[PDB]
Design a protein around this nucleic acid. Structure first.
Length: 48
DNA sequence: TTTTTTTTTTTTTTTTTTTTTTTTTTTTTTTTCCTTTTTTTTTTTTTTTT
C-alpha cells in the first residue's frame, strides 16, 4: 500500500529485502500470519 | 289463581388468531485463536512531623 515500507520499490530493492517481486500484497500480517479481508455483499443503502 | 310467553343467563362449541417449539444428509482432513478484565477493597511502603 502507500504507507508500507514496500511502496514503489524496485525488483532489486525488493529482492535485497528477501521479498518476492511478484507478490501482489493486499494482505495484513497479524502475529506473523497473513490475513486477507473478504469483500462482503450488502444491499445498497439510500435506495428505494 | 294458574298457564304460556318473553327475557335472562349460562353453556358448550367454533373459529380464527397468536404463541410456542422443534427441526434442518453422512464421513473425512488441515490451520488459527483463546482457555479474562477492569473495579473495588486490602495491605504494604514511603514521607513527614513533633
Amino acid at each position: 500500500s502507500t504507507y508500507c515500507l514496500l511502496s514503489q520499490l524496485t525488483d532489486r530493492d525488493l529482492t535485497e529485502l528477501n521479498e518476492c517481486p511478484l507478490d501482489p500484497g493486499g494482505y495484513f500480517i497479524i502475529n506473523g500470519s497473513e490475513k486477507v479481508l473478504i469483500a462482503q455483499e450488502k444491499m445498497a443503502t439510500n435506495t428505494v
